[PDB]
Structures are given as C-alpha cells and as structure tokens.
C-alpha cells in the first residue's frame, strides 16, 4: 500500500516522490496520467510514464485515438496501466501555455471521482502552466475519492504543504 504520505484532508494525501517510482513500488489500481487531448506522451509526467512502459502506453494510446478521436480538455479515458498499475486514467487538464480555460481544471479533477483510489500528479501544473497551489486547492475541493498525490519537485512540495 501507499506509505510516507502526509494527510491533507479526509481523502487527499501528498508525498514528494517521482510518480513513476511510486507506481512501480505500489502497483496501484489506477495511476493518473497528465495527458493532452491527442494522448501524445512526449514530456512531463506523460513522457515519464510512457518511457517507463517502454512506449507500450504510446502504442496503445495511438490505437485509442485512431478509433475514438481526441479527448476533450477536462476529459479522460481509462487505458491499461501496463507495468505501472492495473489501469491508467489519462486525464486532460487545461494547458495554460496553450490558452485553455483554467475553469476546466475542476472538470478534469471530477474524472477522479469515478475511481475509489488513485495515485496522481497535480493536474495542469508543470509544463501545463497553471499555478500548482491552485491545482491542489481545486483537487481538494473537487475529488471525494482517495487520492495520493506525488509531487516530484521537493521545493514545490514544501511550498504546497506550507501554504495549504
Ligand atoms: O510533479 C512535479 O513536481 C512536476 C513538475 C511541477 C509540478 C506539476 C507536476 N509535475 C509534472 O507534471 C512532471 N513533469 C515532468 N516530469 C515529471 N516526473 C514526475 C512528475 C513530473
């Protein structure tokens, strides 16, 4: 099970950890990917999760897009977790660096409510350009299921806990 997490609320927990290493250790039922609408896992959390699957996540993702088309910003799909988890919930938060509406961040976090427990990053943070403090606030105020957040950056983890 999950270990070394700080409890933020009844259902939200947080740890300074690499989500790839956390997924390999825990093998959770669901790992969340910070996806884009095309499921092109080039960089950030998505690039790191995909590289850990030896590109099997990208091959499966390309078949899903060829069949279904792109996701919506704020939407999600469930695919295999490969060697990292039973399932990967690919969730698209708004990318501020591309001009997307930040109000869609709450819709993106609502996808987590379909799963009892998840290992996840903060959506729309990092290379997606949103303020991670805002993303954690929206997470706590939207998700009702058990979420284990992994924050890679130590300095950002410390700021997120101290300002919570
Ligand atoms: O979790 C983090 O600290 C980072 C960076 C800023 C905060 C937002 C989340 N985030 C990422 O999206 C990320 N980006 C690229 N590679 C990564 N490896 C693990 C996480 C990760």
Curated annotation (Swiss-Prot):
Catalytic activity: Thiol-dependent hydrolysis of ester, thioester, amide, peptide and isopeptide bonds formed by the C-terminal Gly of ubiquitin (a 76-residue protein attached to proteins as an intracellular targeting signal)
Domain of life: Viruses
Variant or mutagenesis effect after changing residue 29 to A: In strain: Mu/B.1.621
Summary of activators and inhibitors of this protein: Inhibited in vitro by GRL-0617.
Residue ranges of domain Macro in the record: 1-164
Subcellular location: Host endoplasmic reticulum membrane
Task performed by this protein: Responsible for the cleavages located at the N-terminus of the replicase polyprotein. Participates together with nsp4 in the assembly of virally-induced cytoplasmic double-membrane vesicles necessary for viral replication. Antagonizes innate immune induction of type I interferon by blocking the phosphorylation, dimerization and subsequent nuclear translocation of host IRF3. Also prevents host NF-kappa-B signaling. In addition, PL-PRO possesses a deubiquitinating/deISGylating activity and processes both 'Lys-48'- and 'Lys-63'-linked polyubiquitin chains from cellular substrates.
Quaternary structure, from the entry: May form homohexamers. Interacts with N protein.
Protein name: Papain-like protease nsp3
Native organism: Severe acute respiratory syndrome coronavirus 2 (2019-nCoV)
């Amino acid at each position: 099970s999950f270990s070394g997490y700080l409890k933020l609320t009844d259902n939200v927990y947080i740890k300074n950890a690499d989500i790839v290493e956390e997924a390999k250790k825990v093998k959770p039922t669901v790992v969340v990917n910070a996806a884009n609408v095309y499921l092109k896992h080039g960089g950030g959390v998505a690039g790191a999760l995909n590289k850990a699957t030896n590109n099997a996540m990208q091959v499966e993702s390309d078949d899903y897009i060829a069949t279904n088309g792109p996701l919506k910003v704020g939407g999600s799909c469930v695919l295999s977790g490969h060697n990292l988890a039973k399932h990967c919930l690919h969730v698209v938060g708004p990318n501020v660096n591309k001009g997307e509406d930040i109000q869609l961040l709450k819709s993106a976090y609502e996808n987590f409510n379909q799963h009892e427990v998840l290992l996840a990053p903060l959506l729309s943070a990092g290379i997606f350009g949103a303020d991670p403090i805002h993303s954690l606030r929206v997470c706590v105020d939207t998700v009702r299921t058990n979420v284990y957040l992994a924050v890679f950056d130590k300095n950002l983890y410390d700021k997120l806990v101290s300002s919570f």
